[PDB]
């Protein structure tokens, strides 16, 4: 009756050893028989059952006798999930002398016993000695189990927390760590509290975004860019080599109006706020980690060493990092090139380039993970924890480069090192440096970032789980569980990697796009339930494991924060064009330099653009693109340089150095202020949380 | 009990087989009691309760009448083996060998035990009996328990309580069996005749405990690292000295054909007339010597050396912790609230007082300079700077004691939970007060002096009659160096003199209170009672002074390469000054244990972190290195300059600005400059457009280029030094290989 115990026997299962009869290399069959005989002889009860669907396949069952299992568990440091000790049976009440131990704990202990066995459960599966070994779920999730004794914990947890109907329901970590293990429990607690604080980040970001959005009318520079009498008269220079004429500047009202949203004081305030939000996230997560460590069964002894089933090139890895970064940059550049070489149209072309870049990123991710795995295996880590740590580092670095190259390029290395029209820059020869429009490449950067984040989260979640669930929205236990498949040894690793990449996206380039926390919040709200459903539905049961913290990812979080402060400062200083506007408003709109009687932004664009003379087309005396293109003689370009007819011909003028001094002063002041606040908040742990230590140490 | 038996240096009981551990001193009833005799009787009853409880707990006692004054009674103490072992077991004290488990009586055969007292060193016995005295209780009234030896001296029932020094420091004990550790320490450790021999930290630990041993080990290691730093700094200073004919700007200012022709512009109102830059040819030489690229190299080397010092101190700390086997007692630590006990307002008051202290320091330095300048009428300028620095240092020394007292009051008004909390609050408050007090003037000179003064036409008067001070063309680097060296050297000298003298003069006054020609033999306890009490704070002030010295060494090291040398000589003297005052003019401090220096280590970390930014800002703003580099790289070229190749020629002439004298606007004081009536334009240290021009006196391209270069240099140095410090910290294993093997 699909019972969780042996036939006509009150003994509960802990693994299924499925073996296919060789009758449909006899030394392999002899080894299998010897291993089974030894397993039986060690004092483990076993039953043999033939698959109902196919008689050829026979399943080998195992159990755990109470006395021997308890003795072998007490042999080493295993405590109660009052303390357990074979000298104190009557001292502490036992709910039942046959089922007191948590089924997860019994599965863990018997797994340890099988691990100690030598002719290798996974080795036997690889060699075909025993095809697989995996425990059984309490009940098939479709409907609650008939058996009264079985609590049907799987169905109960599914309905309570894995079904989307509980979307607003708070996290029930109780059954999670009672059934799956400490790893999944801590992972889900971390995910949930991350979402909790992403809510605060998203509300603050939305406040800043509305601050920017409601000031459209008073965005003077955009208004001037649009007014034909002001914007149109500015006949800009061509920004390419062979396929661009003199173009007016008022063709970019849509771009300027969109940019005035993400490039106002709201963005700066939001970056400042995220500066302290990141440290609050880290510190409060440390505190929740400590609280979980105290509350849950995390006082277990730490194992020293273990064997591995399978058992200087460091610079060689860095070369691969460099190649990957260059490949990403090349991919983005060629994508934009091909899309250009054919209101909405320019934005649609940018979106198409971003989509192609994301497609290439996703295609290359598989190659990156494969190469990382092989190179890590070539080193032959002594144990498995070291192997996981090294894989974490290498995989995270490939991901980091592959996902952030394009972003870093657009933010910093695009339009920042191009010369004046007379003497442009060709670093490698015939490879001109692209130049941003007067507003800058901030809008393109934010479009790229939002497209990448969306595409990743959406496509990944859909293709990995949601197909059965979206179409829905539109035999014995051992056989059924066998029909399922495992998650391997890096499923939790992949979930952590996805979450870390999402965190990096939301924190690093947060100045450009103040709405990133909201998208990450929605993604996490989806992802927690998606992962719950997938784990509890489509994947076999897993042996529980104990972990205190998330693992090797916390250092990545700290590094990402320390990098994000600098990245945000650099973005606001260079990528955006707010510092030039501030400097103009406060210094160059006055009689000493300007002509206005009071600080006003009137005439900013006009008075900021530098003029160029076609007659000085080249210092190299080569072919010019300004040939023909009408009877025009002078064109204005995006740079701070002295006009023709000045003693210094096309050299940086006073305004350039004023603006660069302002940029560096902003970088210094913001960096120092944010780091000081971060250090104060890290030093004020005792002065904020008088509650926690007193509560813990009083009782 | 009886009186003095006749053996003056005997450290045993009258029988001669028992050893003394403390001397309990009180005043007998034979004194002329006043006020209320009921209070006197209560003190008596408390005293008999004390003695009764002590005898009950198993401590043998005997009293003795002071030989000179009958009104003083000395009460000895002795710890038999049973009680000593009991309290050692409950303290988890680890016992010497030559892996390990706590100490139990059952295993005497596994330790090198010969006799009861001989096995236990006097320091541990004194600590054990001190704990016994602190914990024991006598009586309860008002439904509140009462106890504590410190409360006894607080109430005046007991004048003091202290262990006994082994013997006279300058003579061996007449007992052939006495180790006379004090004499050995005096002959080899103290008594600066041994100014060079390595101090025997093992004997210091054995005698004065780990609290003093760790301090002196830290001092010695600090001296060694300062020797390394001073050698490097001397190398850099010597390199700067051997190249003076090559400082082209120094030559230009010195040469009368170039510097003399430049008619500089008055800084003053009617106190100074015009003047020729050539007068400033010596300062220029000195600046060459202390602004050189040697200064930059030394600043980077200091950024590295502060780290190396911190991590090597951590390594030595781990070594000491292993060797001195303090782990068990470190694990078992328990403290009780101050017997005085038996918030945000205070914090804001402390911060306001700290701000006031900073402002007072700035104002006193400015007033000293003002009065010295007004009194005016080997360089006379140098003499004026030295006089102003001397006055400022005097006032700083005066205000130091006031700040100490106010910190004491602020911390006492609050209710510290336990001794450690009070100690840490005092550490923080004292360090902040002395930081502000000592460094306000230096920071003012470095950053806020001569940095926000306008052109001569429109000077910056703060609020009226207060014209902002401004520097010479080279900069105030030399003024800062003079002020810093004067402050540091004067503090070293005065501190050493005061430390050596004040306990000594107090002892001589105490003797003079008995002008009668006694000249006789007194027992050990009586003559040890005449030393100073060594107030319970302990090495707090020693650590404070060394932390101030370290702050001076690191914070401003971009303006004084010789600071490590001064610090080295000061520390070589300080080792022996502290050793002498500790061995010869103080009662035995009760031994204890400490993991580290204390609350000061976070202070040292903070100083190291702030040093990078302070040095970067010094080199960027107070020094004129960056303007020189900018001129050599971007203004000695045809686009702006005239030289075909990069060179420092014409630097001074081209750098300065010009001002039309008749272009002095404003109706107040219409005749500040035209009085002389000799020339019509003046040159001042500033980067501004010359007269005429569309932008007459607004900053020119040179100013903004130099500002951008300064900020870029600040960013680059900060980031590179921080990264190198991070990598140095990561690379260092923090524990030596020998320690790893043994541990
Ligand atoms: N020249 C020179 C100086 C020399 C040396 F002789 F070595 F060159 C040494 C020295 O201590 N100082 C020098 N100039 C100083 C100005 C202020 C304070 C100290 C000063
Ligand atoms: C430096 C510069 O761009 N100056 C322009 C000027 O050429 C133009 O005539 C005026 C309005 O038309 O606005 C301003
Ligand atoms: C050397 C030079 O400046 N040549 C010409 C100049 O004569 C002309 O006025 C200007 C406007 O197109 O273009 C350029
Ligand atoms: C304002 C001023 O001092 N200008 C002079 C300039 O007339 C002279 O040509 C140059 C060196 O020859 O030195 C400078
Ligand atoms: C109106 C007047 O006197 N202007 C003079 C100017 O001619 C002279 O060049 C300058 C410096 O000498 O001082 C001022
Ligand atoms: C720009 O202004 C000119 C004024 O002549 C005009 O004709 C054009 O429609 C405006 N808009 C764009 C996008 O060029
Ligand atoms: C000061 O300048 C005068 C005038 O050129 C010159 O004669 C004298 O030698 C100079 N003195 C110094 C010390 O430079
Ligand atoms: Ca001292």
PDB file of N, CA and C in Angstrom, chain A residues 566 570 591-593 642 647-648 651-654 657-658 660-662 664-665 667-668 671-672 679 683, chain B residues 428 609 613 638-640 689 694-695 698-701 704-705 707-709 711-712 714-715 718-719 722:
ATOM      1  N   UNK A 566      33.221  51.865  -5.028  1.00  0.00           N
ATOM      2  CA  UNK A 566      34.103  52.507  -5.998  1.00  0.00           C
ATOM      3  C   UNK A 566      33.426  52.602  -7.356  1.00  0.00           C
ATOM      4  N   UNK A 570      32.694  56.034  -9.404  1.00  0.00           N
ATOM      5  CA  UNK A 570      33.239  56.236 -10.740  1.00  0.00           C
ATOM      6  C   UNK A 570      32.131  56.483 -11.751  1.00  0.00           C
ATOM      7  N   UNK A 591      29.217  86.682 -14.486  1.00  0.00           N
ATOM      8  CA  UNK A 591      29.879  87.675 -15.350  1.00  0.00           C
ATOM      9  C   UNK A 591      31.362  87.398 -15.533  1.00  0.00           C
ATOM     10  N   UNK A 592      32.069  86.936 -14.496  1.00  0.00           N
ATOM     11  CA  UNK A 592      33.495  86.621 -14.701  1.00  0.00           C
ATOM     12  C   UNK A 592      33.743  85.650 -15.843  1.00  0.00           C
ATOM     13  N   UNK A 593      32.881  84.655 -16.026  1.00  0.00           N
ATOM     14  CA  UNK A 593      32.987  83.736 -17.153  1.00  0.00           C
ATOM     15  C   UNK A 593      31.749  83.719 -18.033  1.00  0.00           C
ATOM     16  N   UNK A 642      39.787  74.227 -26.557  1.00  0.00           N
ATOM     17  CA  UNK A 642      39.827  75.606 -27.010  1.00  0.00           C
ATOM     18  C   UNK A 642      39.424  75.697 -28.483  1.00  0.00           C
ATOM     19  N   UNK A 647      45.220  81.051 -28.916  1.00  0.00           N
ATOM     20  CA  UNK A 647      46.665  80.769 -28.900  1.00  0.00           C
ATOM     21  C   UNK A 647      46.985  79.291 -28.768  1.00  0.00           C
ATOM     22  N   UNK A 648      46.212  78.548 -27.978  1.00  0.00           N
ATOM     23  CA  UNK A 648      46.380  77.102 -27.841  1.00  0.00           C
ATOM     24  C   UNK A 648      45.308  76.430 -28.691  1.00  0.00           C
ATOM     25  N   UNK A 651      43.495  72.538 -27.525  1.00  0.00           N
ATOM     26  CA  UNK A 651      43.992  71.991 -26.273  1.00  0.00           C
ATOM     27  C   UNK A 651      42.945  72.189 -25.185  1.00  0.00           C
ATOM     28  N   UNK A 652      42.998  71.326 -24.173  1.00  0.00           N
ATOM     29  CA  UNK A 652      42.034  71.406 -23.084  1.00  0.00           C
ATOM     30  C   UNK A 652      42.080  72.787 -22.445  1.00  0.00           C
ATOM     31  N   UNK A 653      40.912  73.388 -22.260  1.00  0.00           N
ATOM     32  CA  UNK A 653      40.810  74.733 -21.726  1.00  0.00           C
ATOM     33  C   UNK A 653      40.562  74.682 -20.219  1.00  0.00           C
ATOM     34  N   UNK A 654      40.263  75.842 -19.633  1.00  0.00           N
ATOM     35  CA  UNK A 654      40.089  75.926 -18.185  1.00  0.00           C
ATOM     36  C   UNK A 654      38.892  75.098 -17.738  1.00  0.00           C
ATOM     37  N   UNK A 657      39.618  71.345 -16.997  1.00  0.00           N
ATOM     38  CA  UNK A 657      40.305  71.056 -15.747  1.00  0.00           C
ATOM     39  C   UNK A 657      39.441  71.402 -14.545  1.00  0.00           C
ATOM     40  N   UNK A 658      38.616  72.441 -14.650  1.00  0.00           N
ATOM     41  CA  UNK A 658      37.635  72.707 -13.606  1.00  0.00           C
ATOM     42  C   UNK A 658      36.743  71.491 -13.394  1.00  0.00           C
ATOM     43  N   UNK A 660      37.265  68.337 -14.307  1.00  0.00           N
ATOM     44  CA  UNK A 660      37.972  67.143 -13.849  1.00  0.00           C
ATOM     45  C   UNK A 660      38.320  67.265 -12.369  1.00  0.00           C
ATOM     46  N   UNK A 661      38.671  68.470 -11.917  1.00  0.00           N
ATOM     47  CA  UNK A 661      38.884  68.686 -10.494  1.00  0.00           C
ATOM     48  C   UNK A 661      37.607  68.429  -9.712  1.00  0.00           C
ATOM     49  N   UNK A 662      36.467  68.895 -10.229  1.00  0.00           N
ATOM     50  CA  UNK A 662      35.198  68.621  -9.560  1.00  0.00           C
ATOM     51  C   UNK A 662      34.909  67.126  -9.520  1.00  0.00           C
ATOM     52  N   UNK A 664      37.075  64.591  -9.518  1.00  0.00           N
ATOM     53  CA  UNK A 664      37.936  63.920  -8.552  1.00  0.00           C
ATOM     54  C   UNK A 664      37.579  64.305  -7.122  1.00  0.00           C
ATOM     55  N   UNK A 665      37.185  65.559  -6.892  1.00  0.00           N
ATOM     56  CA  UNK A 665      36.736  65.957  -5.564  1.00  0.00           C
ATOM     57  C   UNK A 665      35.486  65.192  -5.159  1.00  0.00           C
ATOM     58  N   UNK A 667      34.617  62.208  -6.255  1.00  0.00           N
ATOM     59  CA  UNK A 667      35.026  60.833  -5.983  1.00  0.00           C
ATOM     60  C   UNK A 667      35.602  60.732  -4.577  1.00  0.00           C
ATOM     61  N   UNK A 668      36.527  61.630  -4.240  1.00  0.00           N
ATOM     62  CA  UNK A 668      37.189  61.562  -2.940  1.00  0.00           C
ATOM     63  C   UNK A 668      36.175  61.735  -1.816  1.00  0.00           C
ATOM     64  N   UNK A 671      33.647  58.765  -1.580  1.00  0.00           N
ATOM     65  CA  UNK A 671      34.310  57.550  -1.132  1.00  0.00           C
ATOM     66  C   UNK A 671      34.626  57.620   0.354  1.00  0.00           C
ATOM     67  N   UNK A 672      35.214  58.731   0.799  1.00  0.00           N
ATOM     68  CA  UNK A 672      35.587  58.843   2.203  1.00  0.00           C
ATOM     69  C   UNK A 672      34.358  58.853   3.102  1.00  0.00           C
ATOM     70  N   UNK A 679      32.362  52.020   8.253  1.00  0.00           N
ATOM     71  CA  UNK A 679      33.169  51.624   9.400  1.00  0.00           C
ATOM     72  C   UNK A 679      32.458  51.938  10.710  1.00  0.00           C
ATOM     73  N   UNK A 683      31.417  49.283  13.520  1.00  0.00           N
ATOM     74  CA  UNK A 683      31.922  49.453  14.876  1.00  0.00           C
ATOM     75  C   UNK A 683      30.809  49.621  15.900  1.00  0.00           C
TER      76      UNK A 683
ATOM     77  N   UNK B 428      39.512  55.681  25.842  1.00  0.00           N
ATOM     78  CA  UNK B 428      38.984  56.410  24.695  1.00  0.00           C
ATOM     79  C   UNK B 428      38.991  57.912  24.948  1.00  0.00           C
ATOM     80  N   UNK B 609      45.381  53.550  10.017  1.00  0.00           N
ATOM     81  CA  UNK B 609      44.444  53.811   8.929  1.00  0.00           C
ATOM     82  C   UNK B 609      44.425  55.293   8.580  1.00  0.00           C
ATOM     83  N   UNK B 613      45.835  58.596   4.797  1.00  0.00           N
ATOM     84  CA  UNK B 613      45.134  59.766   4.284  1.00  0.00           C
ATOM     85  C   UNK B 613      45.824  61.045   4.736  1.00  0.00           C
ATOM     86  N   UNK B 638      56.596  74.393 -25.337  1.00  0.00           N
ATOM     87  CA  UNK B 638      56.268  75.521 -26.224  1.00  0.00           C
ATOM     88  C   UNK B 638      54.815  75.949 -26.107  1.00  0.00           C
ATOM     89  N   UNK B 639      53.870  75.015 -25.955  1.00  0.00           N
ATOM     90  CA  UNK B 639      52.463  75.441 -25.849  1.00  0.00           C
ATOM     91  C   UNK B 639      52.220  76.463 -24.755  1.00  0.00           C
ATOM     92  N   UNK B 640      52.862  76.309 -23.599  1.00  0.00           N
ATOM     93  CA  UNK B 640      52.765  77.272 -22.509  1.00  0.00           C
ATOM     94  C   UNK B 640      54.111  77.879 -22.152  1.00  0.00           C
ATOM     95  N   UNK B 689      45.142  84.887 -12.565  1.00  0.00           N
ATOM     96  CA  UNK B 689      45.411  85.642 -13.774  1.00  0.00           C
ATOM     97  C   UNK B 689      46.044  86.990 -13.429  1.00  0.00           C
ATOM     98  N   UNK B 694      40.468  89.290 -19.378  1.00  0.00           N
ATOM     99  CA  UNK B 694      39.018  89.209 -19.133  1.00  0.00           C
ATOM    100  C   UNK B 694      38.673  88.763 -17.723  1.00  0.00           C
ATOM    101  N   UNK B 695      39.441  87.835 -17.160  1.00  0.00           N
ATOM    102  CA  UNK B 695      39.262  87.354 -15.791  1.00  0.00           C
ATOM    103  C   UNK B 695      40.481  87.813 -14.996  1.00  0.00           C
ATOM    104  N   UNK B 698      40.808  85.799 -11.242  1.00  0.00           N
ATOM    105  CA  UNK B 698      40.231  84.474 -11.093  1.00  0.00           C
ATOM    106  C   UNK B 698      41.281  83.422 -11.419  1.00  0.00           C
ATOM    107  N   UNK B 699      41.146  82.260 -10.792  1.00  0.00           N
ATOM    108  CA  UNK B 699      42.143  81.211 -10.952  1.00  0.00           C
ATOM    109  C   UNK B 699      42.324  80.861 -12.424  1.00  0.00           C
ATOM    110  N   UNK B 700      43.576  80.657 -12.823  1.00  0.00           N
ATOM    111  CA  UNK B 700      43.926  80.386 -14.206  1.00  0.00           C
ATOM    112  C   UNK B 700      44.020  78.882 -14.441  1.00  0.00           C
ATOM    113  N   UNK B 701      44.363  78.509 -15.677  1.00  0.00           N
ATOM    114  CA  UNK B 701      44.453  77.096 -16.032  1.00  0.00           C
ATOM    115  C   UNK B 701      45.486  76.387 -15.174  1.00  0.00           C
ATOM    116  N   UNK B 704      43.890  75.127 -11.807  1.00  0.00           N
ATOM    117  CA  UNK B 704      43.008  73.973 -11.923  1.00  0.00           C
ATOM    118  C   UNK B 704      43.777  72.734 -12.353  1.00  0.00           C
ATOM    119  N   UNK B 705      44.789  72.901 -13.204  1.00  0.00           N
ATOM    120  CA  UNK B 705      45.651  71.776 -13.540  1.00  0.00           C
ATOM    121  C   UNK B 705      46.329  71.229 -12.291  1.00  0.00           C
ATOM    122  N   UNK B 707      45.339  71.588  -9.165  1.00  0.00           N
ATOM    123  CA  UNK B 707      44.340  71.010  -8.271  1.00  0.00           C
ATOM    124  C   UNK B 707      43.983  69.599  -8.723  1.00  0.00           C
ATOM    125  N   UNK B 708      43.769  69.424 -10.028  1.00  0.00           N
ATOM    126  CA  UNK B 708      43.467  68.098 -10.545  1.00  0.00           C
ATOM    127  C   UNK B 708      44.621  67.142 -10.292  1.00  0.00           C
ATOM    128  N   UNK B 709      45.858  67.609 -10.480  1.00  0.00           N
ATOM    129  CA  UNK B 709      47.011  66.752 -10.217  1.00  0.00           C
ATOM    130  C   UNK B 709      47.086  66.364  -8.748  1.00  0.00           C
ATOM    131  N   UNK B 711      44.587  66.144  -6.551  1.00  0.00           N
ATOM    132  CA  UNK B 711      43.530  65.190  -6.230  1.00  0.00           C
ATOM    133  C   UNK B 711      43.825  63.817  -6.824  1.00  0.00           C
ATOM    134  N   UNK B 712      44.334  63.777  -8.056  1.00  0.00           N
ATOM    135  CA  UNK B 712      44.692  62.500  -8.657  1.00  0.00           C
ATOM    136  C   UNK B 712      45.794  61.816  -7.863  1.00  0.00           C
ATOM    137  N   UNK B 714      46.375  62.201  -4.649  1.00  0.00           N
ATOM    138  CA  UNK B 714      45.759  61.720  -3.417  1.00  0.00           C
ATOM    139  C   UNK B 714      45.084  60.382  -3.665  1.00  0.00           C
ATOM    140  N   UNK B 715      44.272  60.305  -4.721  1.00  0.00           N
ATOM    141  CA  UNK B 715      43.548  59.071  -5.014  1.00  0.00           C
ATOM    142  C   UNK B 715      44.525  57.931  -5.269  1.00  0.00           C
ATOM    143  N   UNK B 718      46.464  56.891  -2.033  1.00  0.00           N
ATOM    144  CA  UNK B 718      45.564  56.215  -1.111  1.00  0.00           C
ATOM    145  C   UNK B 718      45.300  54.790  -1.570  1.00  0.00           C
ATOM    146  N   UNK B 719      44.898  54.624  -2.831  1.00  0.00           N
ATOM    147  CA  UNK B 719      44.525  53.298  -3.309  1.00  0.00           C
ATOM    148  C   UNK B 719      45.719  52.350  -3.333  1.00  0.00           C
ATOM    149  N   UNK B 722      46.795  51.469   0.300  1.00  0.00           N
ATOM    150  CA  UNK B 722      45.820  50.589   0.929  1.00  0.00           C
ATOM    151  C   UNK B 722      45.902  49.182   0.355  1.00  0.00           C
TER     152      UNK B 722
END
